[PDB]
Design a protein around this ligand. Structure first.
Ligand SMILES: *[C@@H]1O[C@H](CO)[C@@H](O[C@@H]2O[C@H](CO)[C@@H](O)[C@H](O)[C@H]2NC(C)=O)[C@H](O)[C@H]1NC(C)=O
Lengths: 261, 97, 48, 145, 42
């Protein structure tokens, strides 16, 4: 629709954005490494996606520059945030990524597509036919890489309310590799303003050997219908850029990062 | 990938080293593969076949010393093996030592 | 309080530098006796 | 000598024929390895790559089928052993140890061949069917199968 | 002795109980020789 622009806000990242550098297990040792890391207490945007103007779609999905990595996270309650499409020019002439969560399959694809002006998804499954969610693209020319496996998210919600997800993700591409780190934990208070102060370690999940040149970042939304236009619930996500740093890491007896400096 | 109680060379993930592979009590995380110590040396490894990890300790090695009264007055000598269990190095180890 | 003695230590060059490498032992052999001075000094230190 | 007896090694280290009373360090001892623990990544999979090679139909020369071998451990020595598979020689890589050496992004093609143009599908010459339908780059990769 | 013992040579020189700072460095050619006079003779 004819929605208006929204000036992005800022929030302090606190002591978050630390991951396991290597697969090697080390315990009770204070190892120091040189790698890209999120600086402690840095500004991070706190984009919040909610029902805009009581029924007006909000296109708060900018083409954020990928640069050297991201610290995508969320305080998501129900399943509304999906898609981490990437693109140099975001057209049919550019190889692009698309990380869907179709049922229980990631369906990782590396093919050229044409992207709608405001692509989106339906959180509720379409009746009868499979789903009209493939509206994001209409043409697929050439295909390089395909990957189908278990869904990248193992978060459950059907249990009960009063607790939401705290999905955290780091997207890093270097020397023809693509690594994804994830970690989930429950939440105590519904405070959407700032990130709670707690240490979290981002374990590697999937590694890809593709060599796509990535420069921009795009996010998709899951809205079914007015349940005017396309509307959904409340959600919030953060973007944290990654820059080189030097850290001193302290391991525990079990080999899990407890704190770092 | 399996043998126990004998320090042997291996090619675990390209690593070529010799040590006494034995049972381990470390609780590796599901993704973790290799083990290290304070001196930054391999200490434990992930089992390829199973999910029970093993410890690597190099087998016994050390230096020898010779105690002699002086070649004058007898040539009898005694041999001291520094810092090793006597049971681990009896007089019958000459087959593999 | 006055210090009196310290720890007696011994270092094996061949194993420390080239741990389990016969080719390394043959190559180190061309240097002569580069380890007798260290061993003698350490033994003297221990005796001292 | 310097290996007959402890007195011999003591004399060898002292570089003298006479030894006084005392304790001397001569050499070290190390337990040698006994066997090999064989080593295996314990991979449990075999590539389903025979579907493209053998199927109901073969792709035409003017329209090759698009299929690639990825995340596979497909053995090529069984192909070398197979009598029908007579071409296993490799111009730029190992003919018989091609499978053992690691590689990535292997692409497959299907094209009908008369039989006498196999020598001409390679770069540098034009075959009866390779003049207009099939081709290879200036320095073709892979091996002829 | 209780005040000084936060770190010492380990008191261990049999090497049998090593399965971790000294014996692990033992695999790197750093050994400790025992004193001639024990602490009960001193
Ligand atoms: C990891 O730290 C725990 C500390 O809790 C160590 O002890 C474990 O404690 C939990 C919770 O009390 C028990 O459920 C486990 O059975 C304990 N493990 C035991 C007794 O072996 C644990 O040993 C540490 N693990 C490592 C590898 O250091």
């Amino acid at each position: 629709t004819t929605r208006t622009q929204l000036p992005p806000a800022y929030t302090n990242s606190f002591t978050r954005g630390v991951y396991y550098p290597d697969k090697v297990f080390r315990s009770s040792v204070l190892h120091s490494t040189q790698d890209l890391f999120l600086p402690f207490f840095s500004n991070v945007t706190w984009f919040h996606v909610i029902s805009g103007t009581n029924g007006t779609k909000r296109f708060d999905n900018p083409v954020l520059p990928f640069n050297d990595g991201v610290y995508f996270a969320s305080i998501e309650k129900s399943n509304i945030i999906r898609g981490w499409i990437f693109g140099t020019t975001l057209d049919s002439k550019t190889q692009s990524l698309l990380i869907v969560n179709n049922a229980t399959n990631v369906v990782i694809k590396v093919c050229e597509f044409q992207f709608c002006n405001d692509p989106f998804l339906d959180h509720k499954n379409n009746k009868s036919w499979m789903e009209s969610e493939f509206r994001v693209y209409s043409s697929a020319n050439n295909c390089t890489f395909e990957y189908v496996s278990q869904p990248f998210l193992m978060d459950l919600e059907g249990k009960q309310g009063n607790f939401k997800n705290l999905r955290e993700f780091v997207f890093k591409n270097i020397d023809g590799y693509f690594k994804i780190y994830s970690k989930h934990t429950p939440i105590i208070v519904r405070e959407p303003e700032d990130l709670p102060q707690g240490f979290s370690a981002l374990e590697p999940l999937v590694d890809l050997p593709i060599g796509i040149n990535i420069t921009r970042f795009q996010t998709l939304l899951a809205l079914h219908r007015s349940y005017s236009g396309w509307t959904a619930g409340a959600a919030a996500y953060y973007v944290g850029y990654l820059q080189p740093r030097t850290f001193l890491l302290k391991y525990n007896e079990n080999g899990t990062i407890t704190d770092a400096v | 990938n399996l043998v126990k109680n004998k320090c042997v060379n291996f090619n675990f993930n390209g690593l070529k080293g010799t040590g006494v592979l034995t049972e381990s009590n470390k609780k590796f995380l599901p993704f973790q593969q290799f083990g290290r110590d304070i001196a930054d040396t391999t200490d434990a490894v992930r089992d390829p076949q199973t999910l029970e990890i093993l410890d690597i300790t190099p087998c016994s090695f050390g230096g020898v010393s010779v105690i002699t009264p002086g070649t004058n007055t007898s040539n009898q000598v005694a041999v001291l093996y520094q810092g090793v269990n006597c049971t681990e190095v009896p007089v019958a180890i000459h087959a593999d030592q | 309080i006055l210090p009196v003695s310290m720890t007696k230590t011994s270092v094996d060059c061949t194993m420390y530098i080239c741990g389990d490498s016969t080719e390394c032992s043959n190559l180190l052999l061309q240097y002569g006796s580069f380890c007798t001075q260290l061993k003698r000094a350490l033994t003297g230190i221990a005796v001292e | 000598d310097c290996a007959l007896d402890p007195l011999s090694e003591t004399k060898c280290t002292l570089k003298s024929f006479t030894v006084e009373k005392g304790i001397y360090q001569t050499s070290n001892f190390r337990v040698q390895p006994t066997e090999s623990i064989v080593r295996f990544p314990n991979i449990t999979n075999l590539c389903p790559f025979d579907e493209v090679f053998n199927a109901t139909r073969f792709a035409s020369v003017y329209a090759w089928n698009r299929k690639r071998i990825s995340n596979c451990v497909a053995d090529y020595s069984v192909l070398y052993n197979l009598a029908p598979f007579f071409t296993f020689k490799c111009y730029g890589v190992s003919p018989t140890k091609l499978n053992d050496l690691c590689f990535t992004n292997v692409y497959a093609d299907s094209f009908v061949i008369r039989g006498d143009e196999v020598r001409q599908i390679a770069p540098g010459q034009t075959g009866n069917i390779a003049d207009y339908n099939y081709k290879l780059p200036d320095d073709f990769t892979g091996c002829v199968i | 002795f209780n005040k000084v013992t936060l770190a010492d040579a380990g008191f261990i020189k049999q090497y049998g109980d090593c399965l971790d700072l000294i014996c692990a460095q033992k695999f790197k050619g750093l050994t400790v020789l025992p004193p001639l006079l024990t602490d009960e003779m001193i």
